[PDB]
Design a protein around this ligand. Sequence first.
Ligand SMILES: CCCCC/C=C\C/C=C\C/C=C\C/C=C\CCCC(=O)O
Length: 135
Amino acid sequence: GSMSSFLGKWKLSESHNFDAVMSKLGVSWATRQIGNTVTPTVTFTMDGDKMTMLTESTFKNLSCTFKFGEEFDEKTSDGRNVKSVVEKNSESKLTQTQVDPKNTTVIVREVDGDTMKTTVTVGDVTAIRNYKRLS
Ligand SMILES: CCCCC/C=C\C/C=C\C/C=C\C/C=C\CCCC(=O)O
């Protein structure tokens, strides 16, 4: 219920054009390289009206918890302090916009069966990241 398809765990399987989006984010060379190697595992759980998305890689394990529509501060993996809002588009889709003062990153995550497609957009640049559902 409310993001039922999002519940559970997810491992990255493919990433296309990701160095473009986060060169544009000014992510350092070194953190970008790690971004291009590691395959995070994100977990969602819905807990009442608050959803939590945990990301686990060898780099960092970050997690954050949000109401939909409700702005909230966040530290990104790379280290930018951003103001985020996650909107519910549908039951199989949500959209996390991330505002720092240099750029705004929009992150569409969309569940379709065993795939969650994560589209990441900074201005005119776009990367797509697919996660295969675990178990
Ligand atoms: C612990 C984080 C692991 C991710 C890779 C590590 C570093 C990459 C560096 C910067 C990434 C910065 C911005 C990209 C914005 C959103 C990506 C999350 C999409 C997803 O949910 O796939």
